[PDB]
Every structure is written in C-alpha cells, then in structure tokens.
Design a protein around this ligand. Structure first.
Ligand SMILES: CCCCCCCCCCCCCCCC(=O)O[C@H](COC(=O)CCCCCCCC[C@H](C)CCCCCCCC)COP(=O)(O)O
Ligand SMILES: CCCCCCCCCCCCCCCC(=O)O[C@H](COC(=O)CCCCCCCC[C@H](C)CCCCCCCC)COP(=O)(O)O
Ligand SMILES: C=C/C(C)=C/[C@@]1(C)SC(=O)C(C(C)=O)=C1O
Ligand SMILES: C=C/C(C)=C/[C@@]1(C)SC(=O)C(C(C)=O)=C1O
Ligand SMILES: [K+]
Ligand SMILES: [K+]
Lengths: 413, 413
C-alpha cells in the first residue's frame, strides 16, 4: 500500500500561510527568497546590550504577531497561542472559509516548548505575592498543546487535535501525523504545521552555551551558511507556518485548487546522541526512504530536496550523508535557513510550505551564502540564482535534538 | 480493516512498569488497590506551610525517583528524564532485556510539560550571573521530548521516538500512537506510556486557581471521590508508567507471555472549551466508538470501562454521558483516581496498565469513596470490594485540557 498504488487516498495541499522575517505574506516571502533576500539582521533589542550576548544577529518577524492581537488575547494566550490564532484565521480565509464536517476535521500543530514565558511569569508572580497571584489561565496558556488547541477551538476541529513535539523537527512531524490521520480514515481535512516563540535572551544563551550558533555579527546576512565550507552554526529566524491538507475527493467536492500533493511521510530515530545527529546519516536516510515507500516513488524520482541545513559543521555533514543513503544526492538541494534562519518548532512546517511552492511554481530559490563548496558535502546545492525546472517530486527533511528524523514526500499537482 | 478481521496485525502487551503513591512495584500497587488502599495523604512539604496553600493533600511517590539517582544525573537530566530512565530500565529488565532489531523498535512517551524546573533554574541563573551561567545541557533537559528521547537512546530505539502532548490524556495518547506505528508497519515493538513531574507549590497554585482541586484536607484518603455525589474536585497523585507492546508474532518468536491485547485506539476532540469537557459527551463517546471500530468490537462486547474519572462535578458528568453515547454504560466502571489520584501527563498510561492487569487477573478494584450515587451518572461503579469476573474486553478512557479525547480498547489474552 502506497499512494501510487491507491492503497492510501490521495491527499492534497489546498492552502498555506506563514509569517517570516521577510514578510507576513507567504507569497511575498517567496518572491523575496527568489530575489535573493535575507530576513537576518543585527539584533537591536535592548536584551542584547543588557547581557552583552555573544550572538547579536537574527531575524525577527517582519510583522510582529502582537500587532494583530487585542487586549484580551494579550492577557489570555501565550505567545505561541497568539501566533496559532493569527495563522489559523489567515489560513482558513485563504482556503475560502470552507464549511467542513467538524467530525472529519483534525488539527496537528507542533511547537518546540509551549507558553514558557507564562511559566516564568507565574513563577515570578507567586514568588512576589503568593499562590493567589497565579492566573487561573496559566495552565491552559503554558501546556504545550495550547496552540494546537486554540486552533482546534477557533476553527471547530472535532476529529482530533494533536501536538507532536520533536524539537526542531516538530513542524514537519505535525504534517506527517496529519497525513497519517487522513490516510488511516480518522479525518478528511486537517490544518497542520508549527509555531514557535520569538528570539529572546534566554533562548540565545541556552543554544550559545551549546556552541551551536553563528557569531558572524559584523555581516548578519552572510552568517547563515548551510553546506558552505565557512559555516559556523545556526542563526535564529522567527516564523510560524500552517497548511491545509485534505483528500483529493474532499478538495474537488468544494472546488479547492490544490497547490501540491502530500504523498507520504517517514519518521525514524537515531539512538546515537541527544544533541548531535549520527554522522553516517543512516537512520535519517531511512526516514527519507520510508517517505518514498509510502508515496510509491523511487529515489531517482526525487527532483528536489529541501534540506534541514542548519549551518552547523556537524549537522550539515550528517544530512549530506543521509541524502546519499537515500539515493537522493542527484536532487537539486535548497537550504532555506540560509535566508530565513532557524525557527525551531515551526521550521519544518515553514520549509514544507516552501517545498510546496517549489512544486507549484517550478523553481528553487538560491541557497544564500553558498560560496565555497565543502568536499564532505558533495550535493547539488542551488546557489547564485534560482533553479528552474519541471519538478515532479520533492522531499522536505527535518531533524531534531533527541535524534528525530522526519521526511515528507510531496508531488506536483 | 480491524484487529478482529485481521486487517491489522495482532498487538500484545508483554511487560508493564509503574511507580505510584502506593508502591514503586506495579504488582504491589495492584495488590494494594485490590485491598482498598489509598496513596493519598496529608502533604508534609514545607512549601505547603510556606505559602499556606489551600490544597494540603496529595500522593507523593512511595519511593522517590531520586532515591535511585546520583548527583550527576540529578544535575544533567530533568526530573521527567530521570523518571523515564528509571522506568525504561525497569521495564526492559522485566521484559527479559530482549535483543530486538533497533530499526523496528519505537518509543512513544507523553508528558504534560517537560523539564520545566530547568526553565525557572536557567532563568534564575542568568538573572543572577548572566547568559554564560546557563547550562550547556539546558536545552536538552527542557525540551518536552526529552524523556522519550532519553528512553530511546538508553534502549536503542531507531524506528521513531515520539512525544504526543495532550495534557491529561498524553499517557494514553502515547500508547495510541505506538499502536498506530506498529499497525502501519513502521515498528514491531514499542515502549510507550507517560511520565510527569512531582507535586510542587507552583503546580498546586496553578491548578488550585482553576477551582478544580479538592480541598478536603481533613480526610485526605476520602477527598478523591469520582462519580460520588459529594465529589469536589481532583487530587494530585504522582506516577509514571510504561508498557512494552509488540506484534503477537514478535512476542511468540522470543517466547514472551502476553499480559493482554491492545486492540484499537480512538482519538477525537471536542471543539467546546479549553478547560471544560463538552457536557454532551458526544466527541468523547466517539473516541470510544472509534477504538471499537478499529478493534472490530461492538459496544455490547465491552465488559469494563476504566474511567478517566477526575472527581470534578462537570468532568464526571460529561464522562458518564460519553459512556452512554458509546453504548458502554452497561459495563463495570472503575475510577482509579479515587485511590491513586491524578498524575496529569502520566495518568492515562498508568490507567492503561491497570486495565491490562484487570484483564490479566479477572478482577476490578473498588472505586474508593463511592458512597452516594449521583443520579446524573447512572453507571455500574465497582465499589466496596474488588469485583471478580471473566473480563474479556475493556476500554480505558482519558481526556485532557484542550478538548482531547483518547480511548484504548484492550482484550484479555
Ligand atoms: C526563532 C526563535 C526561537 C526561540 C525558541 C525558544 C523556544 C521557546 C521560546 C519561548 C519564549 C516565548 C517568549 C514570548 C514572550 C516575550 O517575547 O516576552 C518578552 C520578554 O521576555 C520574556 O518574557 C522571556 C521569557 C523566557 C521564557 C523561558 C524560555 C526558556 C528557554 C530555554 C532555557 C532554552 C530553550 C529551550 C528550547 C527547548 C525546545 C526546543 C529544542 C517581551 O516582553 P515585553 O517587554 O513585551 O513584556
Ligand atoms: C502529580 C503532580 C503533577 C504536577 C504536574 C505539573 C507540571 C510538571 C512540571 C515539572 C516540575 C518538575 C519539578 C522537579 C524538580 C523539583 O521537584 O524541585 C523541587 C523544587 O521545586 C522546583 O524546582 C519547582 C520548579 C517549578 C517549575 C515550573 C512549573 C510550572 C507549572 C505551571 C505554572 C503550572 C502547571 C502547567 C501544567 C501544564 C501541562 C498539563 C496540563 C524540589 O527541590 P529539591 O528538593 O531537589 O531542592
Ligand atoms: C540529534 C541531533 C540533531 C538532529 C541535531 C541537529 C542537526 S537538528 C537541528 O535543528 C540542529 C540545530 C543546532 O539547529 C542540530 O544540531
Ligand atoms: C476539555 C477539558 C477537559 C477534558 C477537562 C477534564 C475533564 S480532563 C482532566 O484531566 C480534568 C481535570 C481537572 O483533571 C478535567 O477537568
Ligand atoms: K527542510
Ligand atoms: K482511565
């Protein structure tokens, strides 16, 4: 049973939404990426000078989420819930505000952590004033399923609301489980993707003490260099992204025009190390291969891989080996974190949206900063200008601390 | 496609482990439940008198996790990671330390929040001493997939390590997803269940300010009264629990004796309110119905329901309606939170283990404190003494804030 042999129903992507450091409008982000734009800038936040942080660069959203939030939203939701509400409404409107059967409608939204600012706020309030200063809303704002639950309540989803957490693969893992929910017959339509918090001092300190972050502060747009010989770690770039997926039958019955097909998904784990990927890429390549088995594709069918490509020395080398293991190392490769940075729990969902746009429009944007090939890598990294083609099938990769490997196989509609 | 019709492979439970407020030994917890024991006591923690907390009752683990941990693990793992390492090693030993194929072995472990004490710790450290005082291990201890990832690394699981977060249904949801992973062909064997943090002052304040908790401080063992007319909210009782599931042919091949069969799982959502269950019980009933459809059972086959039964007024009334919607209201009902209290992200896993032991041993423990029947409930609540019977099929219910409904259908082996 595969998508190609009709063992699974055909599942299509019928709407996308994202907010990024380039634009709040996904179509404008996409045009910016194709024009070689970067969302990364010097950080001007007072927290950078307060703490004299070693990292002084990153991409805040172009259009801050809270400029769209009312007084009560700011007091009743954590930041990732507010992002989830903003994007869920935008996605539904982009889909034509369909009146779907709530009992066949699921939501699957990943995030790295949850409403953690409300944990530190509640802690401070109780230390200063005692237990009765904690909000009656604290639990529901903090719980990591909070953003998915807000979207499910907002949009009326009664076929399940799920939150897989797998660190930096959470946003792709969510789209994998939404596809599973549909092909298993538990839903006909799902909103899925990932949301994440903004850049702040404590997140920068924690990842900096792992020695995982770029410190190329003098040239912020040049700092994120996935697959490049001179890379020196990742750069934060804020985002959130959701997509609407549904059976092809369901889309046809309501007149939705698909953007792409979501053909299959593979999830594996390394059992190697908690915070470094296995150098051999074997289990990561097996997640890619499993997505092909469930799609009914061979590796030679894959015209494009949207790489997780964080720009760490270790991570990019492992992913290049994984792509080789899966037989996909003659695909054209894009590493979007070169322009958009790393949004942790959201980023797999953002990069799945970009993989969809590559299939819809026949173009891969250039990987920024790809100037000096690294002989360990040996991939067809698209650089300098966009790569045009009749792309038929593509894989999006995402990986996370914990050893999680997620691959999603998409096709042109 | 159902378990009964052979459309899904047969999946069996081959080992269980749990630590509770009654015992660290699940067989002793089980004997204690049957004897009418309660794990709930007056809280003697200094934090109760420090804050003059309204809630002064709960069940700490009989044997603290950290009596088994050294200072190095106590500094380099969060508490839920330490609980997961302790339980995962105990489970694997109980299973006979099998040499399974890593590439066919998955882990699915839910939790409500994650390594949140390390969030407030890192915040305090940075406020006192700057960003370079944050631990280089802080991210991997905080991330909510951390416990599942520790277990996956410890035991060698390469077929996926998943953490579904759905608040108080997370422990059951994890078992649901592990069953899906096996029946979809991505694993032959899985460790699954849930872990959760201990009772502490800030968790008590947050839930207390929801007005959800019992304050029957005078008579701690009498406080948790699921389905009783005089119930007044839930009581914390610490736990963590894991089970080993595997295909029946994998169990046979290694000579493992099954404890029970895991036949099907249903997940739905309410889209009603963030922290109140839908009064009609309709979507929660449909999670039970879905687990029967995938099992290949009818409601008339069900002998036993292990209720989520938190002892809130509105919660138990909605669940009674859900059990009626599913046609399961002739079954014998147990509410284990009456004795063990509520362990949040672990509790659905704990109660799945108890459902397995009910089928294995042909006995349901008494629901403690069930003294005055409530006309809105109208269920056969087992009480007073344990009830012996030839139980063949049981459903375990769990629900969570966000409107999450999970039902698991188990059978006697
Ligand atoms: C692309 C970035 C991704 C970062 C990913 C981090 C993961 C979670 C990020 C959650 C942060 C949400 C912050 C939103 C609210 C906000 O902004 O509040 C500022 C004031 O600062 C704060 O309250 C800071 C509160 C910090 C909360 C605790 C963060 C703990 C971080 C860990 C120690 C390290 C990261 C763990 C990641 C684990 C999961 C992924 C592997 C404006 O305040 P005001 O002036 O308007 O009053
Ligand atoms: C059955 C209870 C379930 C409760 C579940 C609630 C969530 C669990 C969160 C994990 C808590 C782990 C605590 C382990 C370490 C420990 O205990 O450290 C104490 C000292 O206290 C602390 O550091 C407390 C640290 C507080 C951490 C933040 C807690 C935030 C809680 C939220 C405001 C409210 C709950 C949100 C739940 C959302 C998910 C479920 C809906 C001994 O110190 P020492 O003797 O070693 O010196
Ligand atoms: C098991 C550890 C893995 C997969 C680590 C990666 C490559 S994932 C990721 O997103 C990332 C960074 C630093 O962003 C990694 O270092
Ligand atoms: C949508 C909200 C739900 C399901 C609420 C429940 C009944 S679940 C649970 O575990 C619980 C408590 C207080 O423990 C609830 O109040
Ligand atoms: K990618
Ligand atoms: K239960």
């Amino acid at each position: 049973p595969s998508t190609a042999n009709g063992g699974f129903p055909s599942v299509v992507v019928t709407a996308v939404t994202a907010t990024t450091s380039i634009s709040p409008d996904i179509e404008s982000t996409w045009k910016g990426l194709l024009a070689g734009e970067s969302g990364i800038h010097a950080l001007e936040d007072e927290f950078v000078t307060k703490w004299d942080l070693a990292v002084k660069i990153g991409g805040h959203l172009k259009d801050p989420v809270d400029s769209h939030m009312g007084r009560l939203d700011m007091r009743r939701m954590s930041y990732v819930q507010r992002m989830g509400k903003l994007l869920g409404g935008q996605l539904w409107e982009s889909a034509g505000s369909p009146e779907v059967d709530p009992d066949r409608f699921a939501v699957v939204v990943g995030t790295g952590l949850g409403g953690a600012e409300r944990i530190v706020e509640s802690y401070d309030l109780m230390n200063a004033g005692g237990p009765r200063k904690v909000s009656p809303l604290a639990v529901q704002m903090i719980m990591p399923n909070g953003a998915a639950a807000v979207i499910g309540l907002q949009l009326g989803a009664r076929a399940g609301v799920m939150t897989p957490v797998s660190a930096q693969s959470s946003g792709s893992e969510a789209i994998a489980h939404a596809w599973r929910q549909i092909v298993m017959g538990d839903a006909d339509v799902a909103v899925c993707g990932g949301v994440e918090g903004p850049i702040e001092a404590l997140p920068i300190a924690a990842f900096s003490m792992m020695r995982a972050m770029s410190t190329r502060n003098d040239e912020p747009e040049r700092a994120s260099r996935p697959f490049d010989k001179d890379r020196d770690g990742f750069v934060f770039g804020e985002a959130g992204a959701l997509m609407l997926i549904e059976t092809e039958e369901h889309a046809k019955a309501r007149g939705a025009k698909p953007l792409a097909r979501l053909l299959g998904a593979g999830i594996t784990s390394d059992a190697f190390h908690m915070v470094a990927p296995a150098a051999d890429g074997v289990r990561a390549g097996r997640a890619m291969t499993r997505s092909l088995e469930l799609a009914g594709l061979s590796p030679a069918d894959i015209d494009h891989v949207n790489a997780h490509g964080t720009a760490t020395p270790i991570g990019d080398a492992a992913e290049a080996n994984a792509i080789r293991v899966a037989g996909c190392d003659q695909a054209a490769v894009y590493a979007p974190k070169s322009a958009l940075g790393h949004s942790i729990g959201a980023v797999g969902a953002l990069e799945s949206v970009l993989t969809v746009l590559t299939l819809r429009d026949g173009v891969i944007p250039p990987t920024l900063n790809y100037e000096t090939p690294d002989p360990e890598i040996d991939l067809d990294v698209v650089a300098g200008e966009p790569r045009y083609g009749d792309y038929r099938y593509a894989v999006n990769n995402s990986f996370g601390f914990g050893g999680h490997n997620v691959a999603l196989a998409f096709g042109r509609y």
